Amino acid sequence: DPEGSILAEPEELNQTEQTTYEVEGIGYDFIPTVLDRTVVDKWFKSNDEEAFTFARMLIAQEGLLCGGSAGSTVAVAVKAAQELQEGQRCVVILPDSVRNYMTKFLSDRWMLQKGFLKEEDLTEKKPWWWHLRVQELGLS
Amino acid sequence: DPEGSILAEPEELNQTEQTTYEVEGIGYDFIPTVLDRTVVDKWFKSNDEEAFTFARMLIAQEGLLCGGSAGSTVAVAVKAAQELQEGQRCVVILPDSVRNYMTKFLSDRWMLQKGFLKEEDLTEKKPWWWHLRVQELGLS
């Protein structure tokens, strides 16, 4: 359940200041009639930054062209599933494709504008020549 | 006695191909009537490169604004006087001033043109930034 929504229980997990989140397709300010929370063994809260970062990591390291909700699901799974041991199996549901978020989190510009990515995080992994000026070339 | 001249004895010291030398004021193709070689204990041959280099070293490390002949004299003295020990004294005669050679060996251009100085010898002692291009500046 994204931050700002009240779907997750118990209630104290839902106490947060901001009611709006950039993640889409999940989280609501009301309990749907369809939903049956009794069959849920546990709930987790998730935020936009980790969700989009995990979606990008999924794209870059597994080829799964999935959206932000899949990123949130995987981010929560990597935490909840620490209890499992070898030989046991876990399943994650990836809702939708990246197509719906082409100019959204998939774009570095939008990520930096929202602050979900910081210049230090973007630059720490770049080559040694990244910071050099074009002045260093033999252009003419 | 500069190379190309026949003043020095014994004769085999004077066997060299080139008869012309850039050093001035010393060396001749004949034995002067005034000269008395019998009172000379030893003779040495000298060349332009070492003479001018020693003159420049004299200027740069002792303040003696002397010409090429003084450089030749000091270059020969530093060789001949190795036999002396502590407590003994040596004298060198420095003929003339640097005034007569202002655009000559005193000029790096002329030294490089004559080949008496090589770019490697000039550059080996320069700072680490010497070879960097002006392109490395923050000019605007």
Write out the DSSP string of B101-122. Answer: GTTTTTSHHHHHHHTSS-HHHH
Q: What's the resolution in A?
A: 3.7
H helices then E strands: how many in chain B? Answer: 4, 0
3-state secondary structure of A27: coil
Contacts of A47 (CB under 8 A, 6+ apart): A2, A3, A21
Cα separation, A104 vs B76, whole angstroms: 83
- Closest A-chain CA to B133: A136
Is there a binding annotation on residue A69? yes
Question: Which residues in chain B have their CB less than 8 angstroms from residue A135's CB?
Answer: 135-136
Report phi then psi at A107, rounded to 5: -90, 125
Structure tokens of B123? 């550059």
Structure tokens of A101? 């978020």
Angle, alpha carbons B89-B93-B97 (nearest 5°): 135
Residue A108, strand partner residues: none
A136 touches chain B (CB under 8 A): yes
Cα separation, A106 vs B42, whole angstroms: 90
- The tokens 């876990």 sit on which residue? A90
Cα separation, B10 vs B70, whole angstroms: 23
Residue A46, strand partner residues: A2
Helix B68-80 to helix B48-62 angle, to the nearest 10 degrees? Answer: 90
CA distance A118 to chain B (A): 27
Annotated binding site of B: 69
Q: Determine contact, residues A76/A44, Cβ cutoff 8 Å.
A: yes
How far, rounded to the nearest angstrom, does the alpha carbon of residue A51 sit from its chain's CA centroid? 1
Burial pattern B1-32, b for ≥16 Cβ within 10 A else e, equals bbbbbbbbeeeeebeeeeeebbbeebbeeeee
Indicate the residue type of A140. Answer: S
Structure tokens of A83? 């209890």
Question: Which residues in chain B have their CB less than 8 angstroms from residue A136's CB?
Answer: 135
Interface test mutation site (partner B, options A132, A134, A135, A139, max chain B beta carbons within 10 A)? A135
Cα separation, B45 vs B51, whole angstroms: 11
Helix A48-62 to helix A68-80 angle, to the nearest 10 degrees? Answer: 90
Cα separation, B21 vs B101, whole angstroms: 15
